[PDB]
From a paper:
We determined the crystal structure of bacteriophage T5 dUTPase with a resolution of 2.0 Å, and we discovered a distinct short loop consisting of six amino acid residues, representing a unique structural feature specific to the T5-like phages dUTPases. The comparative analysis of dUTPase sequences from bacteriophage T5 and the host organism E. coli revealed a low identity of only 34%. Despite the low identity, the overall tertiary and quaternary dUTPase structures of the phage and host were found to be very similar, with a root-mean-square deviation (RMSD) of 1.3 Å when aligning the Cα atoms of the monomers. Although there is limited sequence similarity between the T5 phage dUTPase (T5Dut) and the E. coli dUTPase, the comparison of their spatial structures revealed a high degree of similarity, except for the presence of a specific loop in the T5 and T5-like phages that is absent in the bacterial protein. The structure shows the typical trimeric dUTPase antiparallel β-pleated fold of the subunits. Three subunits are attached to each other in the same manner as observed in other trimeric dUTPases, forming three active sites per enzyme molecule in the region of monomer interaction. A comparison of the amino acid sequence and structure of the T5Dut phage with other characterized enzymes allowed us to identify two conserved amino acid residues (Ser68 and Asp85) within the active site that are directly involved in the enzymatic reaction in T5Dut. We have identified a structural element within T5Dut, a small-loop 30-GTNPAA-35 that is only six amino acids long, which is responsible for the implementation of a novel function.
Author numbering:
A (entry chain C): 1 to 139
B (entry chain B): 1 to 136
C (entry chain A): 1 to 134
Write the structure that this text describes.
Amino acid sequence: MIKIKLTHPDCMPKIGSEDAAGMDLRAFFGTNPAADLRAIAPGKSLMIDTGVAVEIPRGWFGLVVPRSSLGKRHLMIANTAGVIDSDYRGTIKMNLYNYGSEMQTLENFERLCQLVVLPHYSTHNFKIVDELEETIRGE
Amino acid sequence: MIKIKLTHPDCMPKIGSEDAAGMDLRAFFGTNPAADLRAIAPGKSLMIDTGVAVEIPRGWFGLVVPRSSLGKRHLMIANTAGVIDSDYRGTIKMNLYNYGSEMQTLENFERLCQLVVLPHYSTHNFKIVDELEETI
Amino acid sequence: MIKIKLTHPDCMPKIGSEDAAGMDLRAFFGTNPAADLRAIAPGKSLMIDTGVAVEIPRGWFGLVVPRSSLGKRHLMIANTAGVIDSDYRGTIKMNLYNYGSEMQTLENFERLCQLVVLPHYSTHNFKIVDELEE
């Protein structure tokens, strides 16, 4: 199981169908009255908290990518894609960058990125060698 | 298996060796349009049909990313990477954005993006908790 | 296991905790003192050799994405993300594009991208179908 800890109950990611690859992470601007909206100007970035901390199982990791709706807004994750290790315990942040020409305003709890949980090879299970075994593709 | 449905036979993804991570998806502008080349200006985007609809096995999903040759052309997917759920049944689209400084032209049936099919954890197998466990 | 061939010993990817999803690929500019620093101006790109060639097991592949810290530097992989097939035997390259407004400089052997090794479905295990099930 993925264990999920929420800063506020409304940070709960949007769960899709049984077949969904991912769950939608939402902006969390806080609970104060002024937390209703935040704006990202063209060429600027904003570190957005999701209010979601996760315990991903050992052997898996979290991939954070934009929702397709982010594409129309010309927003991207500044570091392209978030990689959430299974030992990470803080809340997931989305550092969103405005590569378009118009200012983008976001609502509190708006769905912005997908969290997909995938398996990975153990990064300690490697061996340094002097030559690798050749293949037709090679290069 | 990956079930592949083609709008036109020339939409067939380019499948490489047994060891290839992904298959190459192609632009689809129609059978034989007069405008077989479409230009994308700097700062502009173009929604491109691949002509490819897939059924991906349950427990897996499709990741759509540019081919490496798009890097030199300064084209990205507007939403960075496509996420194709295993219950998606339309054709895959590539919304390509020109982030560079010069016009780029795409050709009908040109290979543009890779479709890699990857496993994912069930998004329903979660539990909300009050506190997370520290790490072993 | 993953087999790794390094052009120079200092190219060794940064290995993290046992839980780490990936290992950090480093810039490899050479063995020079002339190789200490490179600059990438806004709107420009630099093809960066990692000095790292890998033999990834069959059934798996390598995904190369920026480190989190590249986001603050407004550097991206020009082709968004690297896809390393299990039969690729050259060294991994990072073609880094400066999409921001400020100058960036990178040091030799500085950690830049994450390499994550993940399974992929066999692209030969497909059927061409007349019409799909909805």
